[PDB]
C-alpha cells in the first residue's frame, strides 16, 4: 500500500487523518453538549432568560436514580436558586459586580455563598451516616499525626477562640473532616479540616478571626451534620478570607 | 492643593517602583544565570546550532 | 450571559492591582488589570507571528516559522527580520503567561478557593522559560532556543536530541517519561471509574464512593481514595514537568557527550568491572 | 427611550461631545505627524 | 516558627550531603556515598522527634 | 496555609471489606496491613483483593512471562549474580531474525523463546482485561474502565502482534529488555524517516500533553475547592454544592467555558484513550502505508520541500 | 450621523474606553514594528547610513 | 428587504456591534497583510524602488 | 405578534436600524473613496 | 481640552495613577531595549 | 453628571489641574532629554 | 415548496442565522484562497503581469 | 414504500436535518476536492490551458 | 423465514437504523476508494485516456 493514492496525494494516511478530524469535531460537540447539563439555560442579570444562548443546543434530559430512596434527578431540568440573594446592582449595564446589601458572611453571598443542598445527611453504601464524631464512631482513634483534641484554637487576630474537643471522621474514607471547637460560651462549632493548620501547641485558623467564630452556622442535631449545614459552614469559613481581611 | 500633588506623585512612584523592582529582579536573575554559565565549561564544549 | 447560579458570586473584590478599575466582566471572561495585560501581550504576539509569516513569504500555517537569532549574535539584540521578531514574541509570550497566572490568582481570591491552579500553571511557565530563557542564557546564545513553528520546533527537538546520541538515555528524561505515562494511565483510570459509578448498568441506582473503593480493591488490592487520586494527579503532572525541565537544563550545560556513555559508571563499578560475562564483558 | 447603560439622552450627548473633541484632537495630531513623515520620506 | 517535620528535613538534607561526601571518600566511588548517605538521611527524616 | 497536599491527622478504624452487590465473597481475601505512609498520602488500608478464575489465569500467564524473561536474562549473565546485577537493563529477549518471517521455526536461542514469552504475555493481558470487565459487572457499574483498557490494549496489540503480521515478519516486534526496547523505538523512528512527521504521532503527543495538562488542572481544581467538600464528587453530581459551582465559575471566568462534575471526567477518559488510540493508528500506518514520514510531510505541506 | 451619540445608550463608557485604549496602543506598536522590520523606513538604520556611523 | 430592522428583534445590538467590530478589524488586517505579502502591492517596497532607496 | 428575543419593540428596532444604516453607509462611502484612490494609483484589473 | 477633566468622574484617580506609572515605566523600558539592540545608539557599547 | 467615581465636578477640575501640571513638567523633561540626544546623535 | 417556511418551526432562528453567517464567510474565504492559490486566477499576479510590474 | 413518513416517528426531525446538512456539505466538498486533484476535470487548469493563460 | 419481523422485538429500531446507515456509508466509501486506487477501475483516468485529456 506504500505510495498507493486514490487521487492527488490522498492515501490511507490522508483518509485516516481526515476521518480523525471529523471524529474529533463530533466528539468535541458531544463533550460540550454533555457539559451543558448544569447552569443552563443562561440568564440575564435580572433573572430572565438570555437572548443569546450559545452555539451548542441543550442536551436531552437524563435521569439519575439516587441510592437509599433519595429519589431521582433529571438534568437538564428546572433549576431555581430557592434562596434570597442580598446583592444590589452597581451599574445598569451588564458585566459589573453586584454589591452586598448588608453583612456578606451573614447573608451568604460572594466567597461566603452556600447552596441549598439536601437537608439530609450524606449516607455510605450501607445506609449509615458518612460522617460521625469520633466518639460516635466505634473503634476509631487518631493513628499517626499530632492529635488536635485539647489544643487551643487561634484565629487570624492572634487571639484564642476556643479549644478542640472532638474530631469528626469520614467513616468510609477513614479520614478526618471536621474539628469540633468549643467556644467560651460552651457551644460547639465545626471547622473544615482543610481550613485549619495543626501546629505543635495550637490549631491556627487563618480564614477567621476570633470573634467571628461565634457566627459560624451550627448543627441542629449534635450527632450528625447534613449537606446544607456543611455548605453553610464551609461557605462562611471560606468567605472569612475576603471579608475578615481587616482585623 | 500641594498634598494632592504629592499624593498623585506617591501613587505614580508606587506603580513605577513596583514595576522597576520586578524588572530589575528579572535582569539580576538573567545576570545570575549568565555568570553561572560563564563558570561552567561551556566555552570548551559548544553544541551545534539546532535551528536549520 | 450568566449561569443559573452565577449571580451571587459576582461581587466587588479580590483584585491585586487596581480597584473598581478593571473590576468587571466581558461576557463570560473576567477582565482585571492582568486581563488587559494578557489581551495586549497575546494580540501583539499573534500579529507579530502573522507579520513574520508575511516576511518569510508563506501563508501555509504549518510552514510558518519564527527563528531565534543565529549563534553569532550571542545574547544581544538581532535585526527584526533576523531574530528580533522572535525575541519580541518571546517577551510577549512570557508576559501573556505571567499575566494569565496573575489573573487566575485574582479569580481564585474572588471565589474564596485555594491557589493550586496558578501554582500548577507556574510549573509549566517555568518549563517554557527553561527551554527559552535559562538554558540559552547559560549556553551563551538565543539560538539554542526553539523556533516558533508547528513543524520546525519539532526539528529543534530532533536536532537537540540527536546531538547527544539517543536522548532517552538521559536519566532525568527517563523519570519524566515514566511520570508522563503514569499520569495518562491514572487519568484514564480515574475518569473511567467516576463515570462508571455515575453511569451504572441501565436501570440501576447510582453507585457510591464505597463501590469505587470496592472496585479497585477487587481489581488491584488497593484504593487510594478521592482526595488521594486528586493529589496523585496533581503531583504526577507537576513531577513530570519538573523532571523534564531538569533533564533539559543539565543537557548542554553539565553533560556534553552521548548519554548511553553516561550509563557506563554503573558497569565500571570496581567490584564487577572486570567479571568476564554478560553483555559488557 | 431605549436604555442599556442608564445614561439619559443629554448625558450621552455631552459624553459624545467631549469624546468627539478628544477624537478630533488625536486625529489632528495624527495628520500633522503623517504630513511630517511624508515630507521627510514619501511612501507613494 | 518552623515545624518539627521541617527541621527533620533540613537536618536530613545536611546529613545526606555530609555522609555522602564522607562515604564517597571512604569508598572509591561517589555511588557508595550516595547510597549510604541517602539511606541514613531517609532513616533520619522518616522518624520525626516529636 | 494548609494546601491539603498531605494529611496532618490520620485516623484508623475497623477495616472496610467492601460492597456485596453480587460479588462471590468466597473469592476475596482478608484485609492486609495498614500503612502509615499511604495514610499520609491517601488510604492506609491494603486489600482485600479479589482472585477468581480470570485472576488465576492472568497470574499464571504473567508469572510465566516474567519467569521466561528472567531465566533468559540469567542465561545471558552466565548464571552469575554479579553479572546479572551489572548487566541488568542490558539483557533482552530478541524476536526472530528477519529471515524467518512469521514462521514458528526459529530456534529457542534465536527467536523461539521470545514467541513463548509473547504467548504467555498475550494470555495474561487479555485475561486481565476480562477481569476488569467482570469486576465492573459484579458490582453493577458501567464498563468504562474496560473500554479505556481496550484502547491501551489496542496500542499494545499493534506494536506486538498486528503490525508484525502486516509487515510479514516477527523481527518487526519489540524486544523484552530495558534499554533494548528504547533502542527499538529509536531505530523505528530512524528506519521510517522521522516519526515527528507522522501526523498521528503528533495527535498522540497532543493528547499525552493534554492528559498532563487536564489532570493537573483537574487535580488542582478539586484540591482548591476541597475546603467545601469538593473531592466527594459523586454527590456533587447528585447534589450540586458550592464547590462544584465555584469550580465551574473559576474556569468560566478564566477561559470562557466550563464543565460539570461529570463532564470533566468524560473529558478526562477521552483525552487519555485518544493518546493511545491515535498512537495505535500511527504505528500501524508506519511501514505498511508510509515508509518515510518526512517525505510524506513534504508532499502534504508540512515540510518546506 | 447626527444620531451617533446613542452609541453610549448601548455601551458603558468604562469598558469602551478600556478596550479603545488597548486597541489604539496595540495598533500603534504594530505599525511601528512593521516599519522597523523593513530596510526602508527603519529610521535608525537610515540615520546610521546617512551619517556613516556603521 | 424593508423589514430588515426586525433582525434587531432577533439579535442583541451590543453583542452584534462587538462581534462585527472584531470581524471588520480582523478582515482589514488580513487584507492588508495579504497585500503586503505580494511584492507587486507591497507599497513600502514600491516606494523604496520608486525613489531609489536601498 | 412581536416575536421578540431581545425585548426590543418595533419602534426601537426601527430607530436602531436607521442609525446603524447611517453608520454602515458612511463606512461604505469611505471604503469606496479608498478603493477609487487605490485603483487610480494601481489598477488591479 | 475644554472638558477633559470629566474623565476623572469616570475612573478612580488613584488606580489610574498607579496603572499609568506602570505603563510609562514599561514603555520606557521597551524603547530603551529597542535602542540597545541597535548597533548604533548602544551607549553601553561605546 | 455620570459620577461613577464619587468625585464632584469641582474635585475633578482641581485634580485635573494638578495632573496637567505634572504632565507638562514630564513633557518638558522628556523634551530636554530628546534635544540632548538629538544634538549628540541625530536620528533624521 | 410553499411550505418551506415551516422550517422555522423546526429550527431556532438565532442559531440558524449565526451558523449560516459563519458558514457563508468561511465558504467565501475558502473559495478566494483557492483562487489565489492557482496561478491562472490570482488577480494580483495577473495585474502584475498585465501592467509591467516586474 | 408509501409508508416512509413513519421514519419521522422514529428519528427526531431536527437532529436528522443537522446531520444531513453536515453530511451533504462534506460530501460535496470532498467530491469537488477529488475533481480538483485530477489534472483532467480541474476546471481552472482546463480553462488556463484552453485560453493560453500560462 | 417469514418470521424475521420478530427481530424488531429484541432490537430497538433507532439503534439498528443509525448503525446500519453509518455502516452502509462507510462500506460504500471504502469500496469507492479501493476502486479509485486501482488503475484498472479509476474511471477518472479511464476517461482521460479515452478522450486524450493529457
Ligand atoms: C467518516 C469517518 C469518521 C468516523 C466518525 C464520524 C461520525 C461523526 C462523529 C462521530 C463521533 C462521535 C463521538 C462521540 C462518542 C462518545 C460516546 C460516549 O462516550 O458515551 C456514549 C456511550 C456510553 O455512554 P454512557 O452514558 O457513559 O453509558 C453508561 C452505560 O449505562 C453503562 O456503561 P456501558 O457498559 O454501556 O459502556 C460504557 C462505555 C461504552 O461504549 C462502548 O461500548 C465502546 C465499545 C468499544 C469501542 C468499539 C471498538 C471495539 C472493537 C469492536 C469489537 C466490539 C464491538 C461491539 C461493542 C459492544 C457494544 C454493545 O462508554 C464510554 O464512555 C467509554 C469511553 C471510552 C471508549 C474508548 C474505546 C476505544 C477502544 C479502542 C479500539 C481500537 C481498535 C480499532 C481502532 C480503530 C481502527 C483503525 O459510549 C460510547 O458509545 C463509546 C463510543 C466508542 C467509539 C469507538 C471509537 C471510534 C474510533 C475511530 C477513530 C477515527 C478513525 C480514524 C482512523 C481511520 C483509519 C482508516
Ligand atoms: C514540550 C517540549 C517541546 C515540544 C515538543 C512537542 C512535540 C514532540 C510535539 C508537540 C506538539 C505540539 N506542540 Mg510543541 N513542544 C514545545 C513547546 C510548545 C509550546 C510552548 C509555548 O511551549 C506550544 C504552544 C507548543 C505547541 C504545540 C502544538 C502545535 C502541538 C500540540 C500540543 C498540545 O496539544 O498540547 C496539549 C495542549 C492542549 C491539548 C490544549 C490546546 C493547545 C493547542 C492545541 C495549541 C495550539 C498552539 C498554536 C499552534 C500556536 C499558538 C497560536 N509546543 C517544546 C519545545 N510539541 C505535537 C505536534 O503535533 O506538533 C506538530 C508534537 O508532536
Ligand atoms: C527517537 C524516538 C522517536 C519516537 C518514537 C516513538 C515510537 C516508535 C512510538 C512512540 C510513541 C509515543 N510517543 Mg514518540 N518518539 C519520539 C519523540 C517523542 C516525544 C518528544 C518530546 O520528543 C514525545 C512527547 C513522544 C510521545 C509519544 C507518546 C504520545 C506515544 C506513546 C504512548 C504511550 O503511552 O505509550 C506507552 C504505552 C503503551 C505501550 C501501552 C501499554 C499497554 C499494555 C496493555 C501494558 C501491559 C503491561 C504489562 C502487563 C506490565 C506488567 C507490569 C506490572 C504489572 C507492574 N515521542 C522520537 C521522534 N514514539 C508510540 C506511538 O503510539 O506512536 C504513534 C510508539 O509506538
Ligand atoms: C505543568 C503541568 C501541565 C500544564 C498545566 C497547566 N497549563 C495551564 C494551566 C495549568 C494548570 C492553566 O491554568 C492554564 C489554562 O487556562 O488552562 C486551560 C494553562 C494553559 N496551558 C496551555 C497550553 C499548554 N500547556 C501545556 C503543558 C502543561 N500545562 C503541562 C504538561 C502545553 C504543552 C506543549 O504540553 C500547552 C500547549 C494553555 C491552553 C493555557 C494557557 C493560556 C494562556 O496563557 O493564554 C494567554 C496566551 C494566549 C491566548 C496566546 C499567547 C500567544 C503568544 C504571544 C505566541 C505564542 C506562540 C507559541 C510560542 C508558538 C509555538 C509553536
Ligand atoms: C489510556 C492509555 C493509558 C493506559 C490505560 C490503561 N491501562 C490499564 C487500564 C487502563 C485504562 C486498566 O484498567 C489496567 C489496570 O488494571 O490498571 C490498574 C491497565 C494496566 N496497564 C498496565 C501497564 C501499563 N500501562 C501503560 C500505559 C497506559 N495504560 C496508557 C498511558 C504502560 C506504559 C508503558 O506506559 C504500562 C506498563 C498495568 C498496570 C495494567 C494491566 C495489568 C496486566 O495486564 O496484568 C497482566 C500481567 C501480569 C499480571 C504480569 C505480572 C508479572 C509479574 C508477576 C510481575
Ligand atoms: C469574530 C467573532 C467575534 C465574537 C465576539 C462576540 C462578542 C460577544 C460578547 O461577548 O460581548 C462582550 C460584552 C457583552 O455585553 P453585555 O455584558 O453588556 O450584555 C450581553 C448581552 N445580553 C444582554 C444579551 C446578555 O460586551 C462588552 O463587553 C462591551 C465592551 C465594549 C465593546 C465596544 C465595541 C467593541 C467592538 C470591537 C472593537 C475592537 C476590535 C478589536 C478586534 C480584535 C483585536 C485583536
Ligand atoms: C459550534 C459547534 C456546534 C454547532 C451546532 C449548531 C447546531 O446544532 O445547529 C442548530 C440549529 C438550530 O438551532 P436550535 O436551537 O433549534 O437547536 C437544534 C437542536 N438540534 C441540534 C437537535 C437540531 O440548526 C441549524 O443551524 C440549521 C441546520 C440545518 C442544515 C445544517 C447545515 C450545516 C452545514 C454544516 C457546515 C459544515
Ligand atoms: C497590517 O495592517 C496595517 C497595520 C498595515 C493597516 C491595517 C490597519 C487598521 C485596521 C487600522 C485601524 C484604524 C482604526 C480602525 C482606528 C480607530 C481610530 C479611533 C476609532 C480612535 C478614537 C480616538 C478617540 C480618542 C482619544 C478618545 C478621545 C476620548 C477622550 C479624551 C476621552 C473623553 C472624555 C470624557 C468622555 C468625559 C465623559 C464623562 C461625563 C460625565 C460626560
Ligand atoms: C482571502 O479572501 C479575501 C480576503 C481575499 C476575500 C474574501 C473576502 C470577504 C469574505 C469579505 C467580507 C466582506 C464583509 C462580509 C463585510 C461586512 C461589511 C459590514 C457588513 C459592515 C458593517 C458596517 C456597520 C458599521 C460601521 C456600523 C455603523 C453602526 C453604527 C454607529 C452603530 C449605530 C447604531 C445604533 C447606535 C443604536 C442607536 C439607536 C438607539 C435607539 C439607541
Ligand atoms: C531473579 O529474578 C527472577 C529470575 C526470579 C525474575 C526477574 C526477572 C526479569 C529480570 C524480568 C524482565 C522483565 C522485562 C525486563 C520485561 C520487558 C517487558 C517490555 C519492557 C516489553 C516492551 C514492549 C513489549 C511490547 C509491545 C509487547 C507486545 C507483545 C504483544 C502483543 C504480545 C504478542 C503475542 C504473540 C506475539 C505471539 C503469537 C504466538 C502464539 C502461540 C499466540
Ligand atoms: C515599538 O514601538 C516603538 C517603541 C518603536 C514606539 C511606539 C510607541 C508609542 C506608541 C508610545 C506611546 C507613547 C504614549 C502614548 C505616552 C503617554 C504619555 C502620557 C500620556 C504621559 C502622562 C504622564 C502624566 C504625568 C507625569 C503626570 C503625572 C502627574 C503627576 C505627579 C502630578 C504632578 C505633581 C507635581 C507636578 C509638582 C512637581 C513637584
Ligand atoms: Fe475527579
Numbering used by the authors:
A (entry chain H): 1 to 247
B (entry chain X): 16 to 67
C (entry chain L): 1 to 281
D (entry chain 0), K (entry chain 8): 6 to 49
E (entry chain Y): 3 to 52
F (entry chain M): 2 to 306
G (entry chain 9), H (entry chain A), L (entry chain D), M (entry chain F), N (entry chain I): 1 to 54
I (entry chain B): 5 to 49
What did the original publication write about this model?
The reaction center (RC) and light-harvesting complex 1 (LH1) form a RC–LH1 core supercomplex that is vital for the primary reactions of photosynthesis in purple phototrophic bacteria. The RC–LH1 supercomplex comprises an RC surrounded by the LH1 ring that is made of multiple αβ-heterodimers. LH1 collects photons directly from sunlight or from the peripheral antenna, light-harvesting complex 2 (LH2), and transfers excitation energy to the RC. In contrast, some Rhodobacter species, such as Rba. sphaeroides, possess dimeric RC–LH1 core structures, representing the largest photosynthetic complex in anoxygenic phototrophs.
Wild-type (WT) Rba. sphaeroides DSM 158 contains both RC–LH1 monomers and dimers, corroborated by atomic force microscopy (AFM) imaging of isolated photosynthetic membranes. The cryo-EM structure of the RC–LH1 monomer (33 polypeptides, 76 cofactors) at 2.79 Å resolution shows that the RC is surrounded by an open LH1 ring of 14 αβ-subunits, with a large gap (46 Å) formed by a PufX TM polypeptide that has a tilted angle to the membrane plane. The RC comprises the H, L, and M subunits, a bacteriochlorophyll (BChl) a dimer as the special pair to act as the primary electron donor, two BChl a monomers, two bacteriopheophytins (BPhes), one spheroidene (SPO) carotenoid, and a Fe2+ ion, similar to the reported crystal structure. The monomeric RC–LH1 structure resembles the architecture of the RC–LH1–PufX monomer from Rba. veldkampii, except for a missing LH1 subunit and additional densities (assigned as PufY, see details below) that are located between the RC and LH1, on the opposite side of PufX near the LH1 opening. The structures of the monomers within the RC–LH1 dimers of both classes and the WT RC–LH1 monomer are closely comparable. In contrast, the N-terminal domain of PufX (Ala2-Pro15) is not resolved in the structures of the monomer and Class-2 dimer, presumably due to its disordered structure when not binding with RC-H and LH1-1 subunits of the neighboring monomer. Moreover, a putative UQ-10 (QY) that associates with PufY and is close to the RC QB site was identified in the cryo-EM maps of the Class-2 dimer and WT monomer, whereas it was not visible in the Class-1 dimer. The head group of QY is located near the cytoplasmic side and is sandwiched by the aromatic rings of RC-M Trp41 and PufY Phe7 via π–π interactions, forming a quinone-binding pocket. In addition, an extra UQ-10 molecule (QY) was identified in the Class-2 dimer and WT monomer at the gap region between PufY and the RC, suggesting that PufY might be involved in congregating quinones close to the QB site where quinones are photoreduced and protonated to quinols.
